[PDB]
Amino acid sequence: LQDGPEPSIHTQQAYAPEDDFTAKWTRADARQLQRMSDPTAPSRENSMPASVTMPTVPQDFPDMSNEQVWVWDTWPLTDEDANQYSVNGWEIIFSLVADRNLGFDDRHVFAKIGYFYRPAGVPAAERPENGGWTYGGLVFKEGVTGQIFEDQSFSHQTQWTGSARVSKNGEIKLFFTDVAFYRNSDGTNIKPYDPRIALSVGKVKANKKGVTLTGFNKVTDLLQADGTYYQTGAQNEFFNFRDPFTFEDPAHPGETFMVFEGNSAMQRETATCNEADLGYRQGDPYAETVDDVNASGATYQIGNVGLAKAKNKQLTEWEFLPPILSANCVTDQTERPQIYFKDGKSYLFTISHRGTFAAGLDGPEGVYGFVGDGIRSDYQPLNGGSGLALGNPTNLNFLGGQPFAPDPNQHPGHFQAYSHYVMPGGLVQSYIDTIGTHDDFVRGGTLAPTVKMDIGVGGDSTKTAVDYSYGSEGLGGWADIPANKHLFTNGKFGVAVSDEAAQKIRKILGSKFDDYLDGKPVSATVRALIEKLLAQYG
């Protein structure tokens, strides 16, 4: 550690989901990122510790869609505990896609949700190099997603990041960010954009030849920024409000929650931070004053993580609750939040960019994490109070540049990965943004190799470490998003099953099982024979 302030005191103590307590990722916490950086690290080499740095991704990478589309933010098919499912032998993912003929940096306003699929049960090492996914095309018929907007005069209408919850019958509840923009020809707004948390329901239909999706022909408007808990466009034209992740808390069975990204609800130009946002221990020689921070520009960076509660079992109506984390005068962007439960702890993972850190603060692109004793708790940022769990390789001694303009002295993997998502067993999937040097770089738009992050090194709940023994010196399969659970359903009856169970099911049963899985009628005897067996593994 270089000299610098001590991190803040956090207790991890849990509050009721409905209470008005918000954890702070403080300036004292965030500055532990700079203290961890090696100030001797030469040009283009990593300065952060290897245990919290993602393994380096090669620049000569395969493309998952054979360049049919640009792919980025991706999510699996999950249940309420974030287990990942195949349905009738197919693994299924959802991804943000755009037309390949657009410049990569212009994909955002033309983003749509597509899906891929591949057969379950194949080890990463036995797939095609590129992960062996088949592109199934777009989820939504043209027009559908625009229908929730009153003002139909939008210049652009996109579908952004979300989550997908599967039922035992192959029904899918697709939670996603439904966005309208109202723009001028030069990248300037006629009025603030309008990002909404929404839901659309559909269903998987599968057979030997692949998966197709039915439904998704109607969208329900679930939440939009309120202005008391989450910042609105009236408070900030460039407000963040996106990325719903739903789950069940083991402490609160029978209820469904959701985390998402917002900003603290402050008026942009009069926004301020306080002593608690700064978070220094009394008498710490490296302490900042509230005055210096609020004069610095830092108050433009007020990202938060929101919590909402479902009001019915169909998850069609929701209620905001107070934010669970704020990063006031720390970062503008605590993106893609997820809650991951382990050893009785609630882990909050989140991603952020280097450029979105506030004045005086710095850190790598990637996964930042927090641990407490409940979903609303006085979270402790992982790894010595820093919050860094999985940073791209980064020389913090030199400027970060941008994915479209790398810095001459920066590590060529600085933007190698984004929109990281932590999967069961601490496997982490991500997409490649940019890999390479100032004078020799490429854009990705396809998934990186999946990596592995061990959570709770030693007995220490607050510590993580990258498993460099995984796959090839830390790198596993290209676009490997595996299912740990397996659905078998005819569309009405279904069961969830383990990897091993799945194996002997497919074996014990013969070709009539194929028809049953196809939704094709079988005899009442055969149906009963099949479902009685399925029930025994269920």
Side-chain angles (χ1 to χ4, degrees), residues 262-293:
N263 286 130
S264 303
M266 295 191 202
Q267 191 60 227
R268 180 161 135 210
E269 24 284 314
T270 54
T272 53
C273 294
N274 69 20
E275 272 157 318
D277 294 315
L278 272 59
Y280 299 97
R281 297 182 195 189
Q282 180 131 133
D284 186 311
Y286 289 91
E288 292 173 288
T289 64
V290 173
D291 286 65
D292 287 343
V293 182

mmCIF file of all heavy atoms in Angstrom, residues 262-293:
data_model
loop_
_atom_site.group_PDB
_atom_site.id
_atom_site.type_symbol
_atom_site.label_atom_id
_atom_site.label_comp_id
_atom_site.label_asym_id
_atom_site.label_seq_id
_atom_site.Cartn_x
_atom_site.Cartn_y
_atom_site.Cartn_z
ATOM 1 N N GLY A 262 -29.399 3.952 -10.741
ATOM 2 C CA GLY A 262 -29.926 5.319 -10.902
ATOM 3 C C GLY A 262 -28.866 6.330 -10.533
ATOM 4 O O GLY A 262 -27.683 5.980 -10.430
ATOM 5 N N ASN A 263 -29.283 7.578 -10.330
ATOM 6 C CA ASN A 263 -28.449 8.579 -9.685
ATOM 7 C C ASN A 263 -29.190 9.056 -8.430
ATOM 8 O O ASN A 263 -30.416 8.999 -8.371
ATOM 9 C CB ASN A 263 -28.215 9.765 -10.611
ATOM 10 C CG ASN A 263 -27.237 9.471 -11.736
ATOM 11 O OD1 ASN A 263 -27.517 9.728 -12.899
ATOM 12 N ND2 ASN A 263 -26.085 8.968 -11.388
ATOM 13 N N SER A 264 -28.449 9.539 -7.435
ATOM 14 C CA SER A 264 -29.075 10.218 -6.304
ATOM 15 C C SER A 264 -29.919 11.372 -6.821
ATOM 16 O O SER A 264 -29.538 12.054 -7.789
ATOM 17 C CB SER A 264 -28.034 10.724 -5.321
ATOM 18 O OG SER A 264 -27.243 9.642 -4.887
ATOM 19 N N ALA A 265 -31.077 11.569 -6.209
ATOM 20 C CA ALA A 265 -32.054 12.526 -6.751
ATOM 21 C C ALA A 265 -31.725 13.943 -6.272
ATOM 22 O O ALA A 265 -32.305 14.419 -5.296
ATOM 23 C CB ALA A 265 -33.457 12.131 -6.336
ATOM 24 N N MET A 266 -30.748 14.566 -6.936
ATOM 25 C CA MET A 266 -30.349 15.939 -6.688
ATOM 26 C C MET A 266 -30.457 16.731 -7.994
ATOM 27 O O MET A 266 -30.258 16.196 -9.097
ATOM 28 C CB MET A 266 -28.912 16.025 -6.193
ATOM 29 C CG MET A 266 -28.617 15.389 -4.843
ATOM 30 S SD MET A 266 -26.972 15.854 -4.247
ATOM 31 C CE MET A 266 -26.670 14.516 -3.096
ATOM 32 N N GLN A 267 -30.769 18.008 -7.859
ATOM 33 C CA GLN A 267 -30.667 18.937 -8.963
ATOM 34 C C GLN A 267 -29.180 19.042 -9.369
ATOM 35 O O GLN A 267 -28.331 19.390 -8.568
ATOM 36 C CB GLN A 267 -31.225 20.313 -8.547
ATOM 37 C CG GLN A 267 -31.408 21.260 -9.725
ATOM 38 C CD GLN A 267 -32.378 20.713 -10.753
ATOM 39 O OE1 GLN A 267 -32.107 20.733 -11.956
ATOM 40 N NE2 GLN A 267 -33.511 20.204 -10.282
ATOM 41 N N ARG A 268 -28.883 18.709 -10.613
ATOM 42 C CA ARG A 268 -27.508 18.714 -11.142
ATOM 43 C C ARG A 268 -26.588 19.875 -10.715
ATOM 44 O O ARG A 268 -25.502 19.642 -10.198
ATOM 45 C CB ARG A 268 -27.595 18.686 -12.665
ATOM 46 C CG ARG A 268 -26.274 18.689 -13.406
ATOM 47 C CD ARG A 268 -26.532 18.196 -14.814
ATOM 48 N NE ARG A 268 -25.863 19.013 -15.805
ATOM 49 C CZ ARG A 268 -26.306 19.217 -17.041
ATOM 50 N NH1 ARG A 268 -27.449 18.677 -17.460
ATOM 51 N NH2 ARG A 268 -25.594 19.975 -17.870
ATOM 52 N N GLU A 269 -27.006 21.111 -10.936
ATOM 53 C CA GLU A 269 -26.097 22.249 -10.719
ATOM 54 C C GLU A 269 -25.993 22.730 -9.258
ATOM 55 O O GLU A 269 -25.054 23.458 -8.927
ATOM 56 C CB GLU A 269 -26.343 23.446 -11.681
ATOM 57 C CG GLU A 269 -27.731 23.593 -12.295
ATOM 58 C CD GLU A 269 -27.979 22.612 -13.428
ATOM 59 O OE1 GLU A 269 -27.080 22.469 -14.295
ATOM 60 O OE2 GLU A 269 -29.065 21.986 -13.441
ATOM 61 N N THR A 270 -26.909 22.284 -8.392
ATOM 62 C CA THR A 270 -26.844 22.615 -6.970
ATOM 63 C C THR A 270 -26.544 21.389 -6.077
ATOM 64 O O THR A 270 -26.608 21.454 -4.839
ATOM 65 C CB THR A 270 -28.131 23.304 -6.517
ATOM 66 O OG1 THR A 270 -29.259 22.496 -6.858
ATOM 67 C CG2 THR A 270 -28.266 24.655 -7.216
ATOM 68 N N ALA A 271 -26.191 20.277 -6.717
ATOM 69 C CA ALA A 271 -25.869 19.051 -6.008
ATOM 70 C C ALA A 271 -24.674 19.234 -5.072
ATOM 71 O O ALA A 271 -23.729 19.975 -5.387
ATOM 72 C CB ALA A 271 -25.580 17.952 -7.020
ATOM 73 N N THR A 272 -24.721 18.569 -3.917
ATOM 74 C CA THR A 272 -23.645 18.653 -2.933
ATOM 75 C C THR A 272 -23.412 17.326 -2.226
ATOM 76 O O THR A 272 -24.273 16.446 -2.238
ATOM 77 C CB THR A 272 -23.962 19.709 -1.849
ATOM 78 O OG1 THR A 272 -25.253 19.438 -1.297
ATOM 79 C CG2 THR A 272 -23.935 21.131 -2.457
ATOM 80 N N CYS A 273 -22.229 17.202 -1.620
ATOM 81 C CA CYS A 273 -21.864 16.054 -0.823
ATOM 82 C C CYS A 273 -21.589 16.509 0.593
ATOM 83 O O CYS A 273 -21.449 17.707 0.839
ATOM 84 C CB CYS A 273 -20.641 15.349 -1.414
ATOM 85 S SG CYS A 273 -20.965 14.599 -3.044
ATOM 86 N N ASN A 274 -21.507 15.556 1.514
ATOM 87 C CA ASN A 274 -21.296 15.865 2.924
ATOM 88 C C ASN A 274 -20.178 15.051 3.538
ATOM 89 O O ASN A 274 -19.454 14.372 2.834
ATOM 90 C CB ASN A 274 -22.616 15.752 3.726
ATOM 91 C CG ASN A 274 -23.137 14.319 3.875
ATOM 92 O OD1 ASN A 274 -22.423 13.328 3.735
ATOM 93 N ND2 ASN A 274 -24.407 14.223 4.202
ATOM 94 N N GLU A 275 -20.018 15.156 4.854
ATOM 95 C CA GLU A 275 -18.912 14.505 5.546
ATOM 96 C C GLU A 275 -18.970 13.002 5.436
ATOM 97 O O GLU A 275 -17.933 12.352 5.371
ATOM 98 C CB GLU A 275 -18.855 14.908 7.029
ATOM 99 C CG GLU A 275 -18.035 16.161 7.286
ATOM 100 C CD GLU A 275 -18.403 16.870 8.590
ATOM 101 O OE1 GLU A 275 -19.617 16.986 8.917
ATOM 102 O OE2 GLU A 275 -17.461 17.337 9.270
ATOM 103 N N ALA A 276 -20.181 12.456 5.445
ATOM 104 C CA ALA A 276 -20.360 11.015 5.356
ATOM 105 C C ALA A 276 -19.998 10.483 3.937
ATOM 106 O O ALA A 276 -19.419 9.391 3.801
ATOM 107 C CB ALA A 276 -21.790 10.642 5.742
ATOM 108 N N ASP A 277 -20.306 11.267 2.899
ATOM 109 C CA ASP A 277 -19.911 10.914 1.520
ATOM 110 C C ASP A 277 -18.395 10.802 1.435
ATOM 111 O O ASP A 277 -17.873 9.888 0.812
ATOM 112 C CB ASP A 277 -20.409 11.955 0.517
ATOM 113 C CG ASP A 277 -21.918 11.991 0.409
ATOM 114 O OD1 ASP A 277 -22.528 10.890 0.331
ATOM 115 O OD2 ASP A 277 -22.488 13.119 0.401
ATOM 116 N N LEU A 278 -17.703 11.722 2.101
ATOM 117 C CA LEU A 278 -16.249 11.708 2.175
ATOM 118 C C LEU A 278 -15.751 10.532 3.022
ATOM 119 O O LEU A 278 -14.824 9.828 2.626
ATOM 120 C CB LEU A 278 -15.732 13.067 2.708
ATOM 121 C CG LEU A 278 -15.475 14.160 1.669
ATOM 122 C CD1 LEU A 278 -16.726 14.505 0.879
ATOM 123 C CD2 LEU A 278 -14.904 15.419 2.311
ATOM 124 N N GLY A 279 -16.346 10.340 4.201
ATOM 125 C CA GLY A 279 -16.113 9.137 5.013
ATOM 126 C C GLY A 279 -14.771 8.959 5.712
ATOM 127 O O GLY A 279 -14.403 7.839 6.062
ATOM 128 N N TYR A 280 -14.029 10.035 5.951
ATOM 129 C CA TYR A 280 -12.715 9.889 6.600
ATOM 130 C C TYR A 280 -12.870 9.619 8.117
ATOM 131 O O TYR A 280 -13.807 10.098 8.758
ATOM 132 C CB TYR A 280 -11.808 11.102 6.319
ATOM 133 C CG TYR A 280 -11.546 11.275 4.834
ATOM 134 C CD1 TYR A 280 -12.290 12.153 4.083
ATOM 135 C CD2 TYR A 280 -10.585 10.517 4.189
ATOM 136 C CE1 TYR A 280 -12.082 12.275 2.721
ATOM 137 C CE2 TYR A 280 -10.362 10.631 2.829
ATOM 138 C CZ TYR A 280 -11.118 11.501 2.091
ATOM 139 O OH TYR A 280 -10.897 11.637 0.725
ATOM 140 N N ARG A 281 -11.978 8.797 8.659
ATOM 141 C CA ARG A 281 -11.866 8.620 10.104
ATOM 142 C C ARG A 281 -11.326 9.899 10.718
ATOM 143 O O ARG A 281 -10.400 10.501 10.170
ATOM 144 C CB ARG A 281 -10.941 7.467 10.429
ATOM 145 C CG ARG A 281 -11.491 6.160 9.901
ATOM 146 C CD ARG A 281 -10.612 4.990 10.254
ATOM 147 N NE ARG A 281 -10.978 3.849 9.438
ATOM 148 C CZ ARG A 281 -10.527 2.614 9.613
ATOM 149 N NH1 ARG A 281 -9.682 2.337 10.601
ATOM 150 N NH2 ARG A 281 -10.934 1.647 8.793
ATOM 151 N N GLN A 282 -11.917 10.313 11.837
ATOM 152 C CA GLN A 282 -11.524 11.540 12.535
ATOM 153 C C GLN A 282 -10.009 11.609 12.688
ATOM 154 O O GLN A 282 -9.370 10.606 12.988
ATOM 155 C CB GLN A 282 -12.207 11.616 13.902
ATOM 156 C CG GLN A 282 -11.858 12.867 14.710
ATOM 157 C CD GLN A 282 -13.078 13.563 15.272
ATOM 158 O OE1 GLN A 282 -13.113 13.919 16.450
ATOM 159 N NE2 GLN A 282 -14.089 13.775 14.424
ATOM 160 N N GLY A 283 -9.442 12.781 12.426
ATOM 161 C CA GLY A 283 -8.005 12.978 12.516
ATOM 162 C C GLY A 283 -7.124 12.341 11.444
ATOM 163 O O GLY A 283 -5.907 12.410 11.555
ATOM 164 N N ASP A 284 -7.700 11.734 10.402
ATOM 165 C CA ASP A 284 -6.888 11.161 9.320
ATOM 166 C C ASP A 284 -6.148 12.259 8.532
ATOM 167 O O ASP A 284 -6.782 13.091 7.897
ATOM 168 C CB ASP A 284 -7.768 10.353 8.366
ATOM 169 C CG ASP A 284 -6.969 9.616 7.309
ATOM 170 O OD1 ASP A 284 -6.098 10.233 6.645
ATOM 171 O OD2 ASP A 284 -7.223 8.408 7.146
ATOM 172 N N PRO A 285 -4.810 12.242 8.547
ATOM 173 C CA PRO A 285 -4.054 13.323 7.896
ATOM 174 C C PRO A 285 -4.359 13.525 6.402
ATOM 175 O O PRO A 285 -4.171 14.632 5.897
ATOM 176 C CB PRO A 285 -2.574 12.932 8.090
ATOM 177 C CG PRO A 285 -2.549 11.621 8.787
ATOM 178 C CD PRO A 285 -3.949 11.215 9.161
ATOM 179 N N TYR A 286 -4.835 12.483 5.714
ATOM 180 C CA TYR A 286 -5.168 12.581 4.283
ATOM 181 C C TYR A 286 -6.621 12.993 4.019
ATOM 182 O O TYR A 286 -7.088 12.896 2.883
ATOM 183 C CB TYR A 286 -4.854 11.256 3.570
ATOM 184 C CG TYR A 286 -3.379 10.999 3.440
ATOM 185 C CD1 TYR A 286 -2.690 10.299 4.418
ATOM 186 C CD2 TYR A 286 -2.673 11.471 2.351
ATOM 187 C CE1 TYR A 286 -1.343 10.059 4.309
ATOM 188 C CE2 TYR A 286 -1.311 11.258 2.236
ATOM 189 C CZ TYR A 286 -0.650 10.554 3.223
ATOM 190 O OH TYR A 286 0.715 10.349 3.126
ATOM 191 N N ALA A 287 -7.312 13.485 5.048
ATOM 192 C CA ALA A 287 -8.728 13.859 4.939
ATOM 193 C C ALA A 287 -8.930 15.091 4.072
ATOM 194 O O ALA A 287 -8.104 15.981 4.046
ATOM 195 C CB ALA A 287 -9.325 14.101 6.320
ATOM 196 N N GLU A 288 -10.028 15.117 3.342
ATOM 197 C CA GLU A 288 -10.387 16.250 2.521
ATOM 198 C C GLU A 288 -11.450 17.036 3.262
ATOM 199 O O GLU A 288 -12.135 16.491 4.136
ATOM 200 C CB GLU A 288 -10.987 15.756 1.210
ATOM 201 C CG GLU A 288 -10.023 15.053 0.265
ATOM 202 C CD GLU A 288 -10.773 14.460 -0.913
ATOM 203 O OE1 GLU A 288 -11.506 13.441 -0.705
ATOM 204 O OE2 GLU A 288 -10.660 15.029 -2.033
ATOM 205 N N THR A 289 -11.615 18.302 2.911
ATOM 206 C CA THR A 289 -12.727 19.074 3.447
ATOM 207 C C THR A 289 -13.889 19.013 2.481
ATOM 208 O O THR A 289 -13.705 18.901 1.257
ATOM 209 C CB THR A 289 -12.387 20.554 3.659
ATOM 210 O OG1 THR A 289 -12.098 21.167 2.387
ATOM 211 C CG2 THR A 289 -11.208 20.688 4.607
ATOM 212 N N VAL A 290 -15.077 19.132 3.052
ATOM 213 C CA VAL A 290 -16.307 19.140 2.308
ATOM 214 C C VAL A 290 -16.289 20.272 1.286
ATOM 215 O O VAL A 290 -16.770 20.102 0.168
ATOM 216 C CB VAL A 290 -17.511 19.284 3.258
ATOM 217 C CG1 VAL A 290 -18.803 19.455 2.471
ATOM 218 C CG2 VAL A 290 -17.586 18.078 4.176
ATOM 219 N N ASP A 291 -15.730 21.417 1.678
ATOM 220 C CA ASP A 291 -15.625 22.581 0.801
ATOM 221 C C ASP A 291 -14.789 22.303 -0.458
ATOM 222 O O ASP A 291 -15.192 22.672 -1.559
ATOM 223 C CB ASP A 291 -15.013 23.767 1.558
ATOM 224 C CG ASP A 291 -15.989 24.400 2.541
ATOM 225 O OD1 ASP A 291 -16.385 23.735 3.520
ATOM 226 O OD2 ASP A 291 -16.371 25.566 2.318
ATOM 227 N N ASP A 292 -13.628 21.672 -0.287
ATOM 228 C CA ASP A 292 -12.744 21.386 -1.420
ATOM 229 C C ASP A 292 -13.393 20.394 -2.405
ATOM 230 O O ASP A 292 -13.384 20.595 -3.631
ATOM 231 C CB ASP A 292 -11.371 20.874 -0.919
ATOM 232 C CG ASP A 292 -10.505 21.998 -0.291
ATOM 233 O OD1 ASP A 292 -10.807 23.181 -0.534
ATOM 234 O OD2 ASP A 292 -9.523 21.703 0.426
ATOM 235 N N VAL A 293 -13.997 19.344 -1.859
ATOM 236 C CA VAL A 293 -14.702 18.374 -2.694
ATOM 237 C C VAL A 293 -15.881 19.003 -3.466
ATOM 238 O O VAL A 293 -16.038 18.759 -4.676
ATOM 239 C CB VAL A 293 -15.112 17.126 -1.886
ATOM 240 C CG1 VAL A 293 -15.808 16.115 -2.795
ATOM 241 C CG2 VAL A 293 -13.873 16.504 -1.232
#
